[PDB]
């Protein structure tokens, strides 16, 4: 009953609308994941849309160097989870792309895509 992540961007790509979702360290630690091709609900302006998860990639958030951080931790035999919880909170993010398929109309016919 709670949002999976946080929406950080939206755009119109070709004939479709896409938005970008970010999964945070706490949600990734809780075990919450999104499968590719999964159907999700998108709430916007009091309206519910059906969306599909299309993509997934790792990107740095903020002013950080995940490669250097992880390599240094591996070199110095530093177990992030148990020894440096703070260094593990700044690199544990993930990105997803979600396409808006349309809007379900109760007592009516499915409305494809969106202009808003």
Partner 1 sequence: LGLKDFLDDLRLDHYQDLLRELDELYQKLKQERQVPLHGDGEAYPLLTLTVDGGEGRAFEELPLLSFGLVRVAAVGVKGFRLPSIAHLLPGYEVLRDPKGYLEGLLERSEESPAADALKTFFRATGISLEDLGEYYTKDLRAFMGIFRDVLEWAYLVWGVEKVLQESYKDYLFIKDGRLAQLGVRESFRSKLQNYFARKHLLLAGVTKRSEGLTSLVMARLFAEARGTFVLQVPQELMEKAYRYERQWNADLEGAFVMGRRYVARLLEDTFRPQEGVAIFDLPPYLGEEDAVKVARSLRAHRSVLYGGSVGTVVEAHGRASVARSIPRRMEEEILARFRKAFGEDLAKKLTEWLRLAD
Per CB under 8 A, residues contacting partner 1 are 25-26, 62-64, 69, 71-73, 75-78, 83-87, 89-90
Among residues 4, 9, 16, 20, which one has the least CA distance to residue 102?
Answer: 16
Residue 107 Cβ vs partner 1, minimum distance, rounded to whole Å:
43
When the beta carbons of 35 and 109 are compared against a second copy, the nearer one is 35
Which tokens is 70 given?
């992880």
Binding site partner of 55, from partner 1, a second copy, none, Cβ cut-off 5-8 A by kind:
a second copy
Residue 73 Cβ vs partner 1, minimum distance, rounded to whole Å:
5
Place of tokens 């989870």: 81
Residue 86 Cβ vs partner 1, minimum distance, rounded to whole Å:
4
Binding site partner of 8, from a second copy, partner 1, none, Cβ cut-off 5-8 A by kind:
a second copy
When the beta carbons of 76 and 106 are compared against partner 1, the nearer one is 76
When the beta carbons of 7 and 111 are compared against a second copy, the nearer one is 7
Q: How far separated are the first and last CA of the chain, in Å rounded? A: 25
d(CA 97, CA 20): 5
d(CA 72, CA 66): 10
Place of tokens 């070199």: 75
* H or E element in which residue 67 lies: helix 66-75
Which tokens is 14 given?
């070709």
When the beta carbons of 48 and 83 are compared against partner 1, the nearer one is 83
């Amino acid at each position: 009953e709670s949002p999976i992540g946080v929406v950080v961007s939206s755009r119109r790509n070709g004939p479709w609308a896409e938005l970008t979702l970010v999964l945070t360290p706490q949600e990734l630690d809780q075990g919450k994941r999104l499968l590719l091709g999964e159907l999700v609900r998108v709430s916007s302006g009091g309206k519910d849309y059906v969306g599909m998860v299309l993509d997934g990639y790792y990107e740095p958030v903020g002013r950080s160097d995940p490669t250097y951080t992880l390599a240094l931790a591996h070199i110095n035999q530093v177990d992030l989870e148990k020894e440096d919880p703070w260094a593990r909170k700044e690199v544990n993010f993930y990105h997803h792309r979600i396409v808006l398929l349309g809007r379900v109309v109760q007592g009516g016919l499915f409305a494809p895509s969106t202009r808003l």
